[PDB]
Amino acid sequence: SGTVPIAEELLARVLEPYSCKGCRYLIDAQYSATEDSVLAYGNFTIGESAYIRSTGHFNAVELILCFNQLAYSAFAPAVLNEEIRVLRGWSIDDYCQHQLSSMLIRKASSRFRKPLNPQKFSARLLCRDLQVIERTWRYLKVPCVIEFWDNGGAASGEIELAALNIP
Amino acid sequence: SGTVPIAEELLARVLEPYSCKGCRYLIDAQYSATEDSVLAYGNFTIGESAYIRSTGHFNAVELILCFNQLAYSAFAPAVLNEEIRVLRGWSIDDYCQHQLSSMLIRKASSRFRKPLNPQKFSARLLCRDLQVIERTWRYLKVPCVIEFWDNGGAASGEIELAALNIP
Amino acid sequence: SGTVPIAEELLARVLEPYSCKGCRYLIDAQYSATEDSVLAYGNFTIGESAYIRSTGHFNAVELILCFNQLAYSAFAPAVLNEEIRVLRGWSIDDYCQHQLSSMLIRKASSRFRKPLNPQKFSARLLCRDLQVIERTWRYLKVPCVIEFWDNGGAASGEIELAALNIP
Amino acid sequence: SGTVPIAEELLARVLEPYSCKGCRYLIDAQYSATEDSVLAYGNFTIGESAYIRSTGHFNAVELILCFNQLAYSAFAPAVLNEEIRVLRGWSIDDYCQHQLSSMLIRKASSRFRKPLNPQKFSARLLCRDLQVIERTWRYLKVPCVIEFWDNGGAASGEIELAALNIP
Amino acid sequence: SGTVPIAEELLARVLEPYSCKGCRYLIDAQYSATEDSVLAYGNFTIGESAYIRSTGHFNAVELILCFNQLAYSAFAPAVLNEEIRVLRGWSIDDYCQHQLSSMLIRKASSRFRKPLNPQKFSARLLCRDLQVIERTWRYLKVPCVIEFWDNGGAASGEIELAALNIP
Amino acid sequence: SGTVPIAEELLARVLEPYSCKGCRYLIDAQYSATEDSVLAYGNFTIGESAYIRSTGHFNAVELILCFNQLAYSAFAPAVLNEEIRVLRGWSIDDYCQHQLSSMLIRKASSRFRKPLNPQKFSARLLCRDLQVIERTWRYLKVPCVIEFWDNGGAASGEIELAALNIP
Ligand SMILES: CCCCCCCCCCCC(=O)O
Ligand SMILES: CCCCCCCCCCCC(=O)O
Ligand SMILES: CCCCCCCCCCCC(=O)O
Ligand SMILES: CCCCCCCCCCCC(=O)O
Ligand SMILES: CCCCCCCCCCCC(=O)O
Ligand SMILES: CCCCCCCCCCCC(=O)O
């Protein structure tokens, strides 16, 4: 690993958009960062779906939901301790103002094996080769890789984000 | 096209899992079917996210949410008028009992261009080469293709479903 | 890891060429796959050499023998669940017809430290950057990397395969 | 060349470990030797694989198998006529007691072009710069170079042996 | 890992420049090597600073000191068992004559989180893409990556070495 | 420049941690200061390494060692004449009690060209945009820039310090 924990209450701030909806599923997380890469791990629980009755399983909607929360979370301390080069110039204040409106999934790719236990599961996340793209929109493009597990069970994805304001 | 409409109140039954959560986004839909293929079109609106505060845009979570609703919906009249061969033996009664627990996204692939207007948008859906797979689980595998639009804007995906009970 | 197990009796089918000769040495295996990569782990035992009297150690012939069995095995479920892109179009039926005649070692590179216990040992295998080469022969070229251990002990190799029919 | 033949029945003694398994493939051989080098040539045939069903081709396992037999064979008369300096002190009696347990492949490197006819083929072998290494094990290290042919067809390798007892 | 241990007394020889100054801090180490890469792990203790009174913590000077010792150490057995290609032609005798004068840090990059316990800590080291550069000086350039830990605590660096004589 | 000299015997007090170890290398220094910046110049000599036998050159360990001494030294008169705003409230008495335990290198970045003559060399140092950071630790963060020269020869670095007590 080589990863430090992230303070709850940085998390709780970052994920308040979901918590004020009872949709925070990330219990705690640990990160590590460089000039151009972040690695994070998180532990999750799903009490109830906000959107459908009750599947009694994991869903694909919740994979995404958990990826968002972890990515959101993993980039917080990086930005704060100013470890991401391309993002120096953002305070954490900047980051939390640009969460909802300014950070987008461009393309994504999911795979599903043994259905995850929505109750106790975990994820590992790695975003790499971050690079800024100027034009008709100027965005930081963020290639990500995530993997879930828990009872066996696994899922994964390669998702590319766009983050809209920067630097 | 070559597609018939689907009665609301078949829809309303099928999508009640989302409606009882205020998360039905499919306004109406039209389908067409064969031995082994379904084509559907739908019109959507998103009043508010159930899960996050307010993005003011479309999300990836909602792409999936809309795909589910349309697929769910498109297969309803097919099963009822017994047009899907591999599914003859299901009443619509069977179908609605197997919605939540028995129908799953195996793998999926999303693409996003001009952000969709979450207020008034539409989708076109095509599932093809349905085929049953017996083994440690016996499922109908369902290769799907969907495309959204509205103001320009587009998104799309190739998602493979597993449906768990049948025939 | 992030790897699922492989059913014996898929194995037993795939490795029957060796078993009908009492030369199956792979006890069980676990794999993981992508568009263009496979990772597998296996556990081995050698009862007796088929070819020489008795060395009382591991040999280089048996390194190869074990690599073959694991590679053979690791690609089976990938092909079956159609996870390898370049190989979609093969059923598992195709695969088992092309095992003996159509899958070849082009070049290889071995290293040997602490002699492996031929009785209880294990391997880790990773094939990557698979790519098809058309010409006077049309083959899928398969760059592989394997490592053995057990009592300490280690061996390894970088072997390139050619698989002759496809796609 | 500049090479003398090797008596069958020296061969037959040396390769009995394989013959008692029906795995002797070296038909006859010729050698030449110096203080510190051996050159050998051999002619081979493979009736059937001992280990797999039937490939109908050459394999990599059999390349090694043939290298072993030829190396084993080429060093026999050298040791007997006491031509290898570092090995004087071994009778041929010593040599045949240390075959199985005491002679090992450290590292190896194979290349494969036109598939060899397993029925009628030949090899040329050259081991050079033999040198003894004392330590936690005391071995004679033996850098070797071999090349096969037959119908065209070629294969080759640079293999390093360790021989464990000496002098 | 996949790494063998390194004999103390190879270490003790290699690190004598520091030991004769009471500044050897590497207790033991394990390595693994290829044509062009070395991986090593080590365990350290710092009894007292040689240079300053007493900080009661880890320092940056000691990070470097430990990196040197581990790199010095990790390359020893590689060179001896002649596993590094570009360095074949050096005996270990060559290596120990070129330690002090001929091996240099060109550029380096350090990061520090939770202060390391100078008493019991460890490191992981990986040097890769070694390549020789001829000119006004002819050096082997050696891109390295190291990471420390122990009580939590972490530090890391990307340091590039120049080694001056070779091959 | 625009810099005043610093009295030896302020130096000698500040650097006693190194001198009592025969590791003071700063001969004399000159500084200049503002509300939030210090500039210093120093002249150095290295009699012998404390830690290794004898390289006959400059090392990276000694770059750091010299940076510490100069930074340590440059901040002394600033604090004394109370010129650093964020540090007013420290006497020089405070400063010398917090040297060893309370002043740390967070991250650092070194570059090396023409090897410095360890006998007669000089440095130029500039720390800027000092700013206090409250939290789980409350530190003054100190971004620094240093450059060495002497016979040509140059080295440089951007090092960030943390100073732990203040104000
Ligand atoms: C500046 C890099 C930002 C990385 C974290 C953003 C991840 C958020 C994922 C998108 C969430 C959403 O679409 O609502
Ligand atoms: C029998 C074919 C069923 C096709 C409609 C099923 C689509 C439902 C998509 C999965 C929804 C979910 O994961 O909650
Ligand atoms: C299509 C990729 C096939 C990968 C598995 C083939 C590995 C078999 C190794 C060669 C065995 C032999 O030479 O008999
Ligand atoms: C003393 C030199 C011995 C040279 C002949 C030994 C070659 C045998 C090759 C290894 C065979 C094996 O691993 O079973
Ligand atoms: C030939 C590659 C040598 C790798 C080991 C050298 C590492 C030594 C680091 C430099 C030590 C010093 O500057 O005193
Ligand atoms: C209050 C600012 C203090 C600036 C001088 C501190 C520089 C000391 C550098 C760190 C020395 C060490 O790690 O031992």
Greatest C-alpha distance within chain A:
48
Question: From the CB of B123, is ligand 2 less than 6 Å away?
Answer: no
Cis geometry, peptide bond prior to residue E167 (ω within 30 degrees of 0)? yes
- CA-wise closest residue to A161 among A145, A141, A134: A141
Q: Are A61 and B65 in contact (CB under 8 A)?
A: yes
Interchain proximity F21–E51, CB inside 8 Å: yes
Cα–Cα distance measured from residue B91 to residue B80, given in angstroms and rounded to the nearest whole number: 6
Q: Tokens 């492949």 map to which residue?
A: D105
CATH architecture of residue range(s) D1-167: Roll (3.10)
Q: Which amino acid is at F15?
A: L
Cis geometry, peptide bond prior to residue D167 (ω within 30 degrees of 0)? yes
Neighbours of chain D (3+ CB pairs under 8 A): C
Question: From the CB of B27, is ligand 2 less than 6 Å away?
Answer: no
Contacts of B52 in chain A (CB under 8 A): 17-18, 21, 23, 100
Provide Rg for chain F, Cα atoms: 15
Nearest protein Cα to ligand 1, atom 12: A104
The secondary structure of chain E, three-state, reads CCCEECCCCCHHHHCHHHHCCCCCCEEEEEEEEECCEEEEEEEECCCCCCCCCCCCCCCCHHHHHHHHHHHHHHHHHHHHCCCCHHHECECHHHHHHCHHHHEEEEEEEEEECCCCCCCCEEEEEEEECCEEECCCCCEEEEEEEEEEECCCCEEEEEEEEEECCCC
Structure tokens at F47: 């009699």
- Chain C residue with Cα closest to D15: C52
Q: Tokens 């001198």 map to which residue?
A: F19
Q: Read out DSSP for chain F?
A: ---EE--TTTHHHHTHHHHTTT---EEEEEEEEETTEEEEEEEE--SS-SSSS--SS--SHHHHHHHHHHHHHHHHHHHHTT--GGGBTB-HHHHHHSHHHHEEEEEEEEEE-S---SSSEEEEEEEE--EEE-SSS-EEEEEEEEEEE----EEEEEEEEEE-S--
- CA-wise closest residue to C167 among C143, C130, C140: C140
- Chain E residue with Cα closest to A3: E154
Q: Is B19 in a helix, a strand, or coil?
A: helix
Task: Work out how many CB contacts closer than 8 A connect E with F.
Answer: 96
Q: Residue E4 — φ and ψ, nearest 5°?
A: -90, 155
Task: Give D157's strand partners.
Answer: D110, D146
Q: Which amino acid is at E69?
A: Q
| First-residue to last-residue Cα distance in chain D | 28
Nearest protein Cα to ligand 5, atom 11: E68
Q: Read out DSSP for B89-120?
A: TB-HHHHHHSHHHHEEEEEEEEEE-S---SSS
- CA-wise closest residue to C47 among C119, C151, C123: C119
How close C113 gets to chain E, by Cα (Å)? 8
Cα–Cα distance measured from residue D89 to residue B127, given in angstroms and rounded to the nearest whole number: 79
Cα–Cα distance measured from residue C163 to residue C138, given in angstroms and rounded to the nearest whole number: 9
Q: Is A6 in a helix, a strand, or coil?
A: coil
Q: Are E122 and E44 in contact (CB under 8 A)?
A: yes
Q: Which atom of ligand 2 is nearest to the CA of A52?
A: 14
Q: Tokens 């040495």 map to which residue?
A: C25
Name the H helices within E5-129: 11-14, 16-19, 61-80, 92-97, 99-102
The DSSP code for A89 is T
Cα–Cα distance measured from residue E16 to residue B158, given in angstroms and rounded to the nearest whole number: 64
For ligand 3, residues with CB inside 6 Å are: C 68, 71-72, 75, 103-105, 140, 142, 161, 163; D 55, 59-60
Nearest protein Cα to ligand 1, atom 2: A163
Contact yes or no, F with E (3+ CB pairs under 8 Å): yes
Q: Does E56 touch chain C (CB under 8 A)?
A: no
Q: Which residue of B64, B97, B142, B164 to mutate against A (max A Cβ within 10 Å)?
A: B64
Cα–Cα distance measured from residue D107 to residue C158, given in angstroms and rounded to the nearest whole number: 12
How close C85 gets to chain E, by Cα (Å)? 31
Q: How far is the CA of A68 from the centre of ligand 1 (A)?
A: 6
Nearest protein Cα to ligand 3, atom 8: C68
Q: Is B17 in a helix, a strand, or coil?
A: helix
- CA-wise closest residue to E155 among E127, E124, E128, E119: E124
Q: Are E33 and F3 in contact (CB under 8 A)?
A: no
| First-residue to last-residue Cα distance in chain F | 28
Cα–Cα distance measured from residue D59 to residue D121, given in angstroms and rounded to the nearest whole number: 13
Q: Is A113 in a helix, a strand, or coil?
A: coil
Beta pairing class for B121-128 and B4-5: unpaired
Q: Which atom of ligand 6 is nearest to the CA of F95?
A: 1
Q: Are C52 and C133 in contact (CB under 8 A)?
A: no
Q: Please, what is the Cα angle at E90 between E84 and E95, to 5 degrees? A: 95
Neighbours of chain C (3+ CB pairs under 8 A): A, D, E
Cis geometry, peptide bond prior to residue F167 (ω within 30 degrees of 0)? yes
C-alpha distance from residue B126 to each of B1, B14, D98 (Å): 11, 19, 71
Task: Give F122's strand partners.
Answer: F43, F149
Cα–Cα distance measured from residue B62 to residue C25, given in angstroms and rounded to the nearest whole number: 50
Q: Tokens 């110039």 map to which residue?
A: A89
Structure tokens at A63: 């994979």
Structure tokens at C75: 């690609």
Task: Give B38's strand partners.
Answer: B33, B127
Cited resolution, angstroms: 2.8
Cα–Cα distance measured from residue B47 to residue C163, given in angstroms and rounded to the nearest whole number: 54
Q: Tokens 């320092």 map to which residue?
A: E59
Q: How far is the CA of E27 from the centre of ligand 6 (A)?
A: 29
Interchain proximity E149–A2, CB inside 8 Å: yes
Nearest protein Cα to ligand 5, atom 3: E163
Domain residue ranges in chain D: 1-167
Q: Which atom of ligand 6 is nearest to the CA of F72?
A: 5
Q: How far is the CA of B66 from the centre of ligand 1 (A)?
A: 21
Q: Residue F18 — φ and ψ, nearest 5°?
A: -90, -30
Cα–Cα distance measured from residue E152 to residue A4, given in angstroms and rounded to the nearest whole number: 9
Cα–Cα distance measured from residue A65 to residue A159, given in angstroms and rounded to the nearest whole number: 13
Buried b (16+ CB within 10 A) or exposed e, F59-74: bbbbbbbbbbbbbbbb
Q: Tokens 């479920």 map to which residue?
A: C77
